[PDB]
From Swiss-Prot:
Belongs to the DNA polymerase type-X family. It comes from the Eukaryota. Expressed in a number of tissues. Abundant in testis. Coiled coil: none annotated. Residues 91-100 are annotated as: Involved in primer binding. Residues 16-19, 137-176 are annotated as: DNA-binding. The chain holds residues 330 to 575 of 575 of the full protein. This is DNA polymerase lambda. It is found in: Nucleus; Chromosome.
Length: 246
DNA sequence: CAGTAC
DNA sequence: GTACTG
C-alpha cells in the first residue's frame, strides 16, 4: 500500500520520488493530507489543484485549438510570426499530454520583445491561468511553462510550454521540441561519437573531448536553416516527425 | 540535489 | 544528452 501512495504523490507536478518518499514518512497518505499539511512550492500547489486535469490526455483537435489561440495572440503583435505546435502533436499522435508551441520570425529580429507581451496578452484573455516556470536567459531563447484553459463550458486545464527562438536557431529548436525524448537522446548521443554536439540552440562540429571523454572545448556552430540540414550533417537519413516517435 | 522539458 | 529553474 506504500507503492500506490508514492505513485499518487508523484503525479503532482513538481513532485518526484524524493518528495513523495519524504511525504510518506511524514505519514501523509492522501492528496488532502498534502494539501492541508505539506509544504508546497508555488509550482507544486498548482499541480495539486489541477491534479485530475493533468492526468488527462487531450484530443489533438483541442491541441490545435490551443495552438490557434496562441498563434492569434502572437500574430497580433506581428503577423510575420510563426507558431508551430510540437511534441506529440507534431509527431501526429491522436492525443497530447500537453501543448508545446515554438515561436519565431524569419527576419530574425522581430521575435524579440514578444515573449513578455504575449504571455501578458494571454493572461488578459483569461487563457493562461497559472504559471510554473519562466526562463528568460536561454541564450537567445525564452521559455515559459504554464497552464491554460480554452473558453467555454466543460473545459479542463492544460499544460502549455511556449518557447521563442531566433530564426537562425529555429531548426535545432524544432528538432528538440518535437522529440521524442528517446529520439533526441539518440541524435545527441550519435553526435558525441562524431565529435560533435547537439542542443536546442545549434549543432556544433569540432567539439573537443578529453581522454575521459568530458567536453573541454565547444565546437564550431554549423548553420542549419532546416531540420533536414541537421540530419544530413550527422550522416543520417531524414525522418519525419511522425517517424520520430520513439 | 530534485524535477522538469524533449 | 543537453540543459533550464526550484
Amino acid at each position: 500500500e506504500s507503492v500506490p501512495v508514492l505513485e499518487l504523490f508523484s503525479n503532482i507536478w513538481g513532485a518526484g520520488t524524493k518528495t513523495a518518499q519524504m511525504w510518506y514518512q511524514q505519514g501523509f497518505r492522501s492528496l488532502e493530507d498534502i494539501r492541508s499539511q505539506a509544504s508546497l512550492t508555488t509550482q507544486q500547489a498548482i499541480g495539486l489543484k489541477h491534479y485530475s486535469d493533468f492526468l488527462e490526455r487531450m484530443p489533438r483537435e483541442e491541441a490545435t485549438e490551443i495552438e490557434q489561440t496562441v498563434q492569434k495572440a502572437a500574430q497580433a503583435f506581428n503577423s510575420g510570426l510563426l507558431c508551430v505546435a510540437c511534441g506529440s502533436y507534431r509527431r501526429g499522435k491522436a492525443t497530447c499530454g500537453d501543448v508545446d508551441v515554438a515561436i519565431t520570425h524569419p527576419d530574425g529580429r522581430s521575435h524579440r520583445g514578444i515573449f513578455s507581451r504575449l504571455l501578458d496578452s494571454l493572461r488578459q484573455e483569461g487563457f493562461l491561468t497559472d504559471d510554473l516556470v519562466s526562463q528568460e536567459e536561454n541564450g537567445q531563447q525564452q521559455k515559459y511553462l504554464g497552464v491554460c484553459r480554452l473558453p467555454g463550458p466543460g473545459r479542463r486545464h492544460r499544460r502549455l510550454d511556449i518557447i521563442v527562438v531566433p530564426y537562425s536557431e529555429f531548426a535545432c529548436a524544432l528538432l528538440y521540441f518535437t522529440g521524442s525524448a528517446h529520439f533526441n537522446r539518440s541524435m545527441r548521443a550519435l553526435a558525441k561519437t562524431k565529435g560533435m554536439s547537439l542542443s536546442e540552440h545549434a549543432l556544433s562540429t569540432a567539439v573537443v573531448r578529453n581522454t575521459h571523454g568530458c567536453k573541454v572545448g565547444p565546437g564550431r556552430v554549423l548553420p542549419t536553416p532546416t531540420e533536414k540540414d541537421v540530419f544530413r550533417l550527422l550522416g543520417l537519413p531524414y525522418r519525419e516527425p511522425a517517424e520520430r516517435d520513439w
